[PDB]
Design a protein around this ligand. Structure first.
Ligand SMILES: *C(=O)[C@@H](CSC[C@@H](COC(=O)CCCCCCCCCCCCCCC)OC(=O)CCCCCCCCCCCCCCC)NC(=O)CCCCCCCCCCCCCCC
Lengths: 5, 505
């Protein structure tokens, strides 16, 4: 998925 | 005779039989390799001390997880920020950790059942194998990967999946392989015939279909594969291009495909921020008569005035008007370890530097969630990793479910065997629940799986294209969907309690 932005 | 009683050769030979088990999964699809691999594990642990059997079991596991989940290195090395030697160590540590349960299985099996008899290989080992496999799939949220039950998706034991589940196929595989190992070692044809009969019994079960297809409810489903680069995905500047890529791929599909699916987290920006896009897009879909089911990341307030970041599946269009405060959404429950949350985050915090530990973490959605509604269609959602948890999918499954929904993002692992193994486990859910599976991925295997775990439509990986095809919903409940894993656990309890009670004498 990977969060961050 | 010589140098086979020695443990060194027997320990080295366990790596080969362990590594042989990885050939049984999706990229290779050799289901006899599963039988040979388990046969090697059973045979090599014969007439060994409990500590020596555990070492054999650990090395058998290290062979299986040293080549079956070695694709994790691709995700770790491509975007990990850690030195090269460090990346290799983490993959070794993961293989070593998962090999403990295989080492525990062999260590306990030889301790309580030292003599090589039919009880050990047919009654004791399969019961103990499920207990150790359960612990591997439960401790620290578990990692139920490389289970040999999934290797029989196209094998002759696929008929047992809709009756008891995948965890019963590898239960039966341990019985058959253990009896074959017993026959080979002792040169006795009796364990060989019993192994053949037990393996040939579930074959007519694969011709039984528990579902009645519904031709009157056939729809055209289009799944868009964005093929957004993983490195540039979560960036400011690629957000506008990502929206335009999906919007321009979806615009011709409106009014012709009744259900449109975007991959996991197709919209990278937060749902609260991308409101005008979703509101305008919902208007286009409703007017032309289509529904969109896309993955997004949503941050929600709560009672304590914090933010709970969820991996959400929002639905728009006809049959499901979009609203921020709506119920037609699915929040991911089982987060990926070290990918979406840090297990033992209170203990691994000092070791978080020089380990690329993620600072933030997703919030886990409720274990049981209602099926998604889109254009009068019920979908049982399962985001990426959740499609390998057969028990969780069954719990969320309902009789009114038309299709099984899955959106994933396998762009982390690139050209490796990982996406295929993940894809193979997804096919088992369709076979177990007798429902078509609508799997959409960023660049992975975007495919439509039939009610019997059969690939109906598929598109090549690493391409930016849509998968438009007609899918017919199925109705009817499998015995697995009605009961679950508890009929198997009773069999495990009966085999386990009897095996222990025989060992007590
Ligand atoms: C999105 O939907 C994805 C999830 S994100 C998938 C991707 C993300 O990759 C990255 O973000 C790159 C960096 C990955 C994280 C590295 C962190 C390392 C921290 C230290 C680790 C060791 C700690 C202990 C010693 C100090 O890829 C990943 O998430 C890769 C995950 C790598 C995991 C490394 C594990 C290291 C060995 C641990 C051994 C056990 C230790 C126990 C101590 C008590 N998801 C999807 O779309 C679906 C993906 C499906 C496939 C998922 C493949 C990864 C599975 C990882 C299972 C870990 C099980 C741990 C034990 C329960």
């Amino acid at each position: 998925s990977k969060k961050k932005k | 005779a010589s140098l086979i009683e020695r443990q060194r050769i027997r320990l080295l030979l366990a790596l080969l039989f362990g590594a042989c088990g990885t050939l049984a999964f999706s990229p290779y699809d050799v289901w006899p390799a599963a039988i040979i691999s388990l046969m090697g594990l059973q045979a090599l642990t014969f007439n060994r001390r409990p500590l020596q059997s555990a070492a054999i079991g650990f090395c058998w596991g290290f062979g299986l997880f040293g080549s079956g989940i070695n694709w994790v290195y691709v995700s770790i090395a491509t975007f990990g920020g850690m030195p090269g030697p460090v990346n290799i160590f983490l993959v070794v540590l993961l293989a070593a950790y998962l090999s403990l349960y295989t080492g525990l299985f062999a260590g306990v099996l030889s301790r309580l059942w030292p003599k090589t008899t039919w009880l050990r290989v047919a009654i004791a080992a399969p019961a103990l194998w499920q207990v150790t496999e359960f612990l591997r799939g439960w401790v620290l949220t578990g990692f139920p990967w490389l289970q040999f039950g999934y290797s029989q998706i196209d094998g002759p034991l696929k008929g047992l999946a809709p009756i008891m589940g995948v965890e019963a196929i590898n239960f039966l595989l341990m019985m058959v392989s253990g009896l074959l190992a017993l026959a080979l070692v002792k040169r006795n044809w009796r364990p060989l015939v019993v192994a053949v009969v037990l393996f040939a019994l579930p074959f007519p079960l694969r011709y039984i279909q528990w579902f009645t297809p519904q031709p009157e409810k056939t729809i055209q489903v289009s799944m868009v594969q964005g093929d957004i680069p993983q490195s540039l995905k979560w960036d400011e500047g690629q957000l506008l291009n990502t929206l335009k890529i999906y919007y321009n791929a979806t615009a011709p599909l409106m009014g012709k495909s009744s259900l449109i699916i975007w991959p996991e987290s197709a919209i990278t920006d937060l749902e609260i921020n991308q409101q005008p896009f979703l509101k305008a897009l919902d208007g286009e879909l409703r007017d032309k008569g289509s529904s969109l089911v896309t993955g997004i990341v949503d941050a929600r307030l709560n009672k304590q005035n914090r933010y709970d970041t969820y991996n959400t599946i929002i639905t728009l269009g006809k049959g499901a008007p979009y609203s921020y405060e709506s119920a037609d959404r699915y929040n991911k429950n089982h987060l990926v370890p070290f990918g979406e949350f840090v297990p033992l985050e209170s203990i691994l915090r000092p070791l978080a530097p020089f380990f690329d530990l993620p600072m933030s973490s997703f919030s886990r959605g409720p274990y049981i969630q209602p099926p998604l509604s889109a254009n009068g269609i019920e979908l049982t959602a399962a985001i990426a990793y959740e499609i390998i948890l057969g028990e969780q999918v069954r719990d969320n499954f309902r009789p009114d479910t038309d299709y099984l929904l899955t959106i994933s993002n396998d762009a982390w692992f690139g050209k490796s065997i990982g996406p295929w193994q993940h894809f193979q486990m997804a096919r088992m859910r369709a076979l177990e629940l007798a429902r078509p599976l609508l799997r959409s991925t960023n660049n992975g295997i975007t495919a439509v799986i039939g009610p019997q775990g059969e690939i109906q439509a598929m598109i090549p990986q690493f391409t930016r294209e849509v998968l438009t095809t007609n899918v017919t919903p199925t109705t009817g409940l499998t015995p697995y969907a009605r009961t679950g894993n508890w009929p198997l656990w009773v069999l495990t309890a009966l085999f386990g309690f009897a095996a222990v009670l025989m060992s007590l004498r």
